[model samples]
Target: GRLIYTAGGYFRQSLSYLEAYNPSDGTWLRLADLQVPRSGLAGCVVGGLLYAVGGRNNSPDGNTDSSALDCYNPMTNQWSPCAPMSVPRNRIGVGVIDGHIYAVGGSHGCIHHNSVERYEPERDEWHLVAPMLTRRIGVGVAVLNRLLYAVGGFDGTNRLNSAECYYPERNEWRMITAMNTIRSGAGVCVLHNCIYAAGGYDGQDQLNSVERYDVETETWTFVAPMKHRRSALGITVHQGRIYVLGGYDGHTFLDSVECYDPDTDTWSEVTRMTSGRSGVGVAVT
Candidate 1:
């Protein structure tokens, strides 16, 4: 089956979908467009529902922000509003674990946030959860062994290497070993018990470096670097392989796609996307 991905609107615009690739045939196909235009949002799929969280909406010259929570139903090719987040933020991290959706840290236009919240589809509502220990935006989040882990992002002034994990059973957040290099706007996904963080921008440079977090040891270790240095890439795991979609390479937006196989420790280029964009939201159904 082909994997579907969505990128939030570019440059303070609405969102769109990029048919990433069909791993079996290495082909790309275009999908439906997102209901609203947005960037710096987060996404995750659960029970056939694609949820896009908070992100900025207007350009810097006319700054506007949103706390929109929109859900897309691919079967119906339509979108509907969901419960709004308590705090309006952008550059946040979204994930689904068990039966709930988690919306993690982002900024509220002015400052970095550590606030975390959970949404219940059954109740059509959101509840406050434990906040991260460190305030950040553009962080990467992944779930492994029933625990949630958040990685590299910026606090406001500079990029950060700090990492932390959330234990829902205890309803608390704890610091974990930090990333080797500080960065933000990275992509992350959990495969084979390791949380992989990939393609983010440091303050002075774009990074292709990939790192993995070891939950058992609460530490980070280096993995294979990507073919290009990029940020705000869409990342997801399907059939045990990690797929990196369109992202920014500092000067330009990219449509190139790449897949990583941990078993062979190699990356293979996939079909390029139809459009170039960054700050994408990806999910697999």
Candidate 2:
């Protein structure tokens, strides 16, 4: 049994928790709702605190603006306002390394951005860091060996297959091998030293394909396809298994959830979410 948190998508977006699920038993239980509604946001867990970052609200103009940073404490089932981000963006990527939360590339006012910012809870502020090489939106990010890896995302014009790794020690970014196919709004999570990228759209089509990158090899490899093609899905690692959550197919949003076991190289359906959504973020508590 593990706890899963999902962020944003759809019209009335909110965060929800899945109490437990066994691919063997195929069940899930609902927890609580997020304080605010949002879409295209990113989240990460650091020091038992779940930090949800920038995403758009229900504005008529559909603005890509958000300055909100909300932190949730599972033990108390309460949320507290955190320091706002320096930049207002949506579809951002978030990761935590060495106790600090890092928020990466996202979109603002129709422009994709490359800015990188770090949140320090102790000081209650955000500090800028080395920006990404490519300005992308809806990208996936994960930390391995203390390095932040940013994967495929849309570059305003089209989806990109490019990838890069950020070195905090040097405050620099270096390009890595590109993915086999261009994708955006995918789910990313690290497991067993490899970063797993799953379920995204390539601008033209929804994708169920899964890809993995080994830190030691600096290469990309294809893995098993998901049960359904989707975009803007939520992904997280729980108990050594990778869980793929709600996302949109071509025509409709989805609530179906699935998990992939690297040990057996197999995928099996799990419980459906209480709500259908996409552009959500997931993290383990």
**Predictions in order: lDDT:** 0.81, 0.82
lDDT of model 1 at position 26: 67
* Model 2 Cα lDDT, one tens digit per residue, 210-237: 9999877878899999988888888888
- lDDT score at residue 209, model 2, on the 0-100 scale: 93
Candidate 2 residue-wise lDDT at 63: 51
Model 2 poorest ten-residue lDDT run: 13-22
TM-score of 1: 0.93
All candidates' TM-scores?
0.93, 0.93
Error of model 1, residue 113, in angstroms = 1.1
> Which candidate achieves the best TM-score against the true structure?
1
Instruction: Give the alpha carbon lDDT tens digit for every residue of 1-285 in model 1.
Output: 645656574733445553445678766656666666677787788787878888877654565566778887767767788889998878888878887998888988787998999999888999999889888798999988778888888887878888888999999999888888887999988989899999798888888999888877877788888897889888888889998887888688887788899998888777677777787787776
